[PDB]
Amino acid sequence: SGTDKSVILLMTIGEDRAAEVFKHLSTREVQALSTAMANVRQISNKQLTDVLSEFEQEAEQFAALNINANEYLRSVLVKALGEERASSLLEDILETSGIETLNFMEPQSAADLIRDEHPQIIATILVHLKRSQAADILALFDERLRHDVMLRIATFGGVQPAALAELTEVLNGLLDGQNLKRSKMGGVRTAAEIINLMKTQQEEAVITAVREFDGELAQKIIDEMFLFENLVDVDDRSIQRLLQEVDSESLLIALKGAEPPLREKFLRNMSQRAADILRDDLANRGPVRLSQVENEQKAILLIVRRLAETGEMVI
């Protein structure tokens, strides 16, 4: 049979080659081949030669020049329609057991679903669930239930297959219209974009109301509205004022972390000697951690906001 021929091929190609092939095979195929492999006792020379001949004849046809379909498709979609459309199309293309289905669900919904269950059952399901999903679910539980689950998981001794099957059937029965669960449309960022499109008086009202509410997401939107990479679109005088109001080291670090166009714009806005000194210091220095560069850019953006509010800078 073809399974026996594949088993002989895997035996005769070497452990490394067979292991590499199994990395390109599904779980069912790997399990079936391994089960067939363990029962192999003899492989005669005629059988070996026939297997080699058949495999070579099949490989003559393909010879398919295998391509990484996922990576190539992602790159094509990105370079064609941007990151957002590419990611949306990949999600559409990508889109089962009850436990596996729960792993494909929202944390709060699954948490409330299993919350109406015996704590041992909750612990068993969470063990059978993905670690990240289980951690998200447990963070939403009450302190007493969370402690009980953590205690039970620390003393988990395995479940009977019949109990596992019954639990899976119950979870399947409890399922709802989870098809196309959740949707990425917008929020916060879209609100910031809309605010940027509303009048100066309207954005004054916006500052007012956002400060009035929770305050935390208000500051988050303060940070979000306008970014450091948007400084390239500002007029030269505002950039020069920023150079005046920004320390040399912070500006140098920010330019190091920024794009060559923004760096060249800042250098042009600087004097010749100062720009040359900045370039020499950049060349003579070493790599800077991303966190430090981000902090310096945040400080520079705070200075930008301060100058813009006073009217010295136009955004």
């Binding site: 049979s1 073809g2 399974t3 021929k5 594949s6 091929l9 895997l10 005769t12 190609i13 070497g14 080659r17 590499e20 092939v21 990395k23 390109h24 095979l25 195929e29 079936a32 081949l33 080699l52 495999f55 070579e56 099949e58 490989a59 393909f62 010879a63 398919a64 295998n66």
Partner: peptide, 27 residues
């Protein structure tokens, strides 16, 4: 045991996986 074994060992693992899948389907 000629050089055919070495040539097969040098083939791409994806090709071997596809051949194995085809044989399993034909089973």
């Amino acid at each position: 045991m000629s050089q055919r074994i070495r040539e097969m060992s040098d083939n791409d693992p994806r090709v071997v996986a596809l051949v194995i899948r085809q044989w399993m389907s034909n089973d």
